[PDB]
Amino acid sequence: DENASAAEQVNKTIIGIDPGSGIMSLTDKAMKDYDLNDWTLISASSAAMTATLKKSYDRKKPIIITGWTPHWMFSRYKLKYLDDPKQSYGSAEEIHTITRKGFSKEQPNAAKLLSQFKWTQDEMGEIMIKVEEGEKPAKVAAEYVNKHKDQIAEWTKGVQKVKGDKINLAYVAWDSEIASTNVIGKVLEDLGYEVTLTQVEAGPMWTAIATGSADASLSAWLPNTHKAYAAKYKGKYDDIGTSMTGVKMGLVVPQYMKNVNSIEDLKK
Numbered sequence: 001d002e003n004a005s006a007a008e009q010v011n012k013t014i015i016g017i018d019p020g021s022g023i024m025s026l027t028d029k030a031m032k033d034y035d036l037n038d039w040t041l042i043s044a045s046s047a048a049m050t051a052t053l054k055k056s057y058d059r060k061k062p063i064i065i066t067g068w069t070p071h072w073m074f075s076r077y078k079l080k081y082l083d084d085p086k087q088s089y090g091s092a093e094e095i096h097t098i099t100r101k102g103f104s105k106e107q108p109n110a111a112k113l114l115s116q117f118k119w120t121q122d123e124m125g126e127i128m129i130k131v132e133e134g135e136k137p138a139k140v141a142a143e144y145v146n147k148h149k150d151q152i153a154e155w156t157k158g159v160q161k162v163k164g165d166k167i168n169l170a171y172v173a174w175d176s177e178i179a180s181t182n183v184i185g186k187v188l189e190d191l192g193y194e195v196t197l198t199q200v201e202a203g204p205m206w207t208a209i210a211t212g213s214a215d216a217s218l219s220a221w222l223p224n225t226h227k228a229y230a231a232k233y234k235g236k237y238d239d240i241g242t243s244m245t246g247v248k249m250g251l252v253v254p255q256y257m258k259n260v261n262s263i264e265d266l267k268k
Helices: 022-033 046-058 108-115 121-132 137-147 149-155 175-191 204-211 227-232
Strands: 013-015 040-042 065-069 079-081 093-100 166-171 194-199 216-222 237-254
Touching (some): 022 040, 022 227, 022 237, 108 175, 121 175, 121 237, 216 227
Parallel strands (some): 166 216
Antiparallel strands (some): 093 216, 093 237
16 A cells, blocks of 8 residues: 555554563553554564564565664664653663572672673673574673673672582573573683573563572563562562663664654554
């Protein structure tokens, strides 16, 4: 149709990720806030969303996805966030490092390391790009700790080596969190820790931390994205670090969709 709206072009459909993720919750809210209730949000997964993104992009087809930043797709593709004047996705979002309760006094050495873990979107991007191109996260992390010596010394500042202390990192298989988890896991490994990486859904990751079935996680997006999880387990986890600031999430489109610039444009 020559005069097709944005809505018409994508058939009132948004391509999402795993249904337990916060971005999906926030998108459910956005759709109510912007009176997009006749729209369909497709639950899927990180990998299905990016495969779908690839197919549409290479054909220059209209598509709207649940996107976030830090993510390699912004490097691979020319994408933009739809303006969110209602701030349905919130503001001032960060990635946090959380532990099971008591961990800081229980394992103060590892807690100090975890509290001092910080890095940038481009630094995480280094790992994520190499992982999507086919390298194993463990090997890419090993490259990173060797390449970035001065940073790793910052993280380990006043942190000591140990003799086999067990530690269990819960994580969710988002591209960003696979990168942060493996890089910190390697640093712990280099420090002498016996490291287990426990992959879980969103929901289960919070539950693991809140019950102490896992020790720590780098997968907390706060305060907006995992608002509901944090509220559910309010007194039952410690927030010991902020590994990244200025992170974002929302509805994302290719830049070739020139006339679609705000979530308000989807009302049409």
